[PDB]
Structures are given as C-alpha cells and as structure tokens.
C-alpha cells in the first residue's frame, strides 16, 4: 500500500495472508468470507506468463495477523487448504477479466477478536454504494512504493497498512489505460488535481476493497485488488475485481462443494 498508514489492531479481521511453504514468503492478500471459505484473486494462484500455478499443498493461509513477518503466537491461526476453485472463465491471456478464486479450508477456523468474516454485497447494497466519488478501503502487506528494487530504502511494511480511496467513473478508468476493461472490474484512486494520493501495490493482490454500509453499519467487500500499471502514478488508477458481478459463481461453488 502506497501512502497509507498502519492499521489499528482488529481493524480488518477478515484480512488473510496467503503464504508459500517453500520458500516461506508472502504470496498475496485474501479475505475470510465464512469459517471455511477464503476469497482471493485467481492470478495469485494461476498466471502462466510468469509460470505460476500453485496447488493446495503449496500454500498455507494465515488469519488474524497484523505484523507481516512475526509468527503471532496465540493470535494468528494457520490453515491448510482442502481445495482451490478458480473462475472457469478467468482470462489470464488478455486483461485478468473475472480475476477471482475461492479456497476451502481443511477445517473451520474459530472466530475471535482478530478473526471475523466480511459480508458479500447484495444487489441493493452494490447499487447504493458503488458510485463514483464514494470511498472504500484497501488493506495489505505489499510494497510501500513502486521501486526501491533490490537497492536501498526497504519498502516492505512492518504491519498491515490501510488506505481509503474514491471509486472513479468508468470513462476516466477506461481513458487511463490501453488494457481493455470489462464490467467485471472497477477502478479507484485520487485524480491528479485532487491533491490526495494512495494506491495498492505489489504484494497487495487478492486483498479486499471494502465499504461500510450507512444503512446497517456492516462492512461489505466490493472489490478484490487485481491489477494496476505502477503504484500511485498520477493519472493512473488501481483496478479491482467487481465482487457483486461474480457473486452467482461464488454462491454456486459454495452450494455445490461446501
């Protein structure tokens, strides 16, 4: 997350860390949507251009975390995966259209002060809230700035970072990139004239874009961090999987395999 700040303890109890067993390293963010289903972006698991194709035995999910690197004894829970499900029409060839995957945990996780699921939107919450100008919130342990590289500066955070960003109107999203954008994506970020900054960045993929309903006070997950060109570049915006457009596939998978 670029230009965000440290999260408060318990501020995003649905945030999940996808963690590679060997080498032990951060893979992607993810979110807890029930006691045994985690939602993430499909490209975290399958991306043939970079030869990524992970299976269940390659990964662990770590839930209830705050520190990026510490094993948080007595707070975090670690679970193994029973099965991964990638959207059958995920388009990794062109534009990461339908970038969404579900993961079934081997055993249910117990909830706590630090571990609690986010809600998935219904038609009407999506309708009232997914509007240009309305802000949502993104969280993750990804890089703090685009570059740094293998040089000086560091750039990986000590704890979970958070940033609040406005949804941008679809014309503006479309005119900022050469990628073909679909109805299954939306973009968010400040415009150059607005004088505030912020964005997701490398390592934040798969993480939740959430909004708090003013009608019932609950937090709903509206987006999944999917792609962007650079991190926090003026005139460029972050793109997110539109979770409500893909909800019928989510419901189907959980009803058939849960």
């Amino acid at each position: 997350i670029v230009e965000g700040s440290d999260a408060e303890i318990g501020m995003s109890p649905w945030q999940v860390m996808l963690f590679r067993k060997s080498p032990q390293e951060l893979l992607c963010g993810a979110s807890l949507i029930s006691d045994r289903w985690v939602l993430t972006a499909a490209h975290c698991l399958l991306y043939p251009p970079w030869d990524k194709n992970f299976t269940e035995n390659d990964l662990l999910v770590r839930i209830g975390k705050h520190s990026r690197t510490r094993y948080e004894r007595n707070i975090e829970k670690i679970s193994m995966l029973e099965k991964i499900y990638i959207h059958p029409r995920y388009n990794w060839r062109e534009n990461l259209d339908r970038d969404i995957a579900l993961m079934k945990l081997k055993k249910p996780v117990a909830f706590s002060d630090y571990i609690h699921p986010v809600c998935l939107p219904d038609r009407e919450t999506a309708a009232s809230l997914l509007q240009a100008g309305y802000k949502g919130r993104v969280t993750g342990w990804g890089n703090l700035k685009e570059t740094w590289t293998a040089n000086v500066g560091k750039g990986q955070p000590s704890v979970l970072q958070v940033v609040n960003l406005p949804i941008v109107e679809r014309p503006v999203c479309k005119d900022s990139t050469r990628i073909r954008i679909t109805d299954n994506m939306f973009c968010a970020g400040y415009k150059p004239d607005e004088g505030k900054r912020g964005d997701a960045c490398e390592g934040d993929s798969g993480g939740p874009f959430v909004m708090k309903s003013p009608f019932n006070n609950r937090w709903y997950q509206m987006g999944i961090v999917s792609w962007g060109e650079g991190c926090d570049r003026d005139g460029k915006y972050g793109f997110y999987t539109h979770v409500f457009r893909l909800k019928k596939w989510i419901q189907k998978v959980i009803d058939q395999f849960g």
Binding site: Q24, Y47, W50, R62, T69, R70, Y71, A200, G207
Partner: peptide, 9 residues
C-alpha cells in the same frame, strides 16, 4: 500488470 519471515511451525 498483475499486482525475512520468522519460521512458522
């Protein structure tokens, strides 16, 4: 395009 760990048991 697409977007020092302490050992765990």
């Amino acid at each position: 395009x697409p977007x020092d760990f302490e050992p765990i048991p």
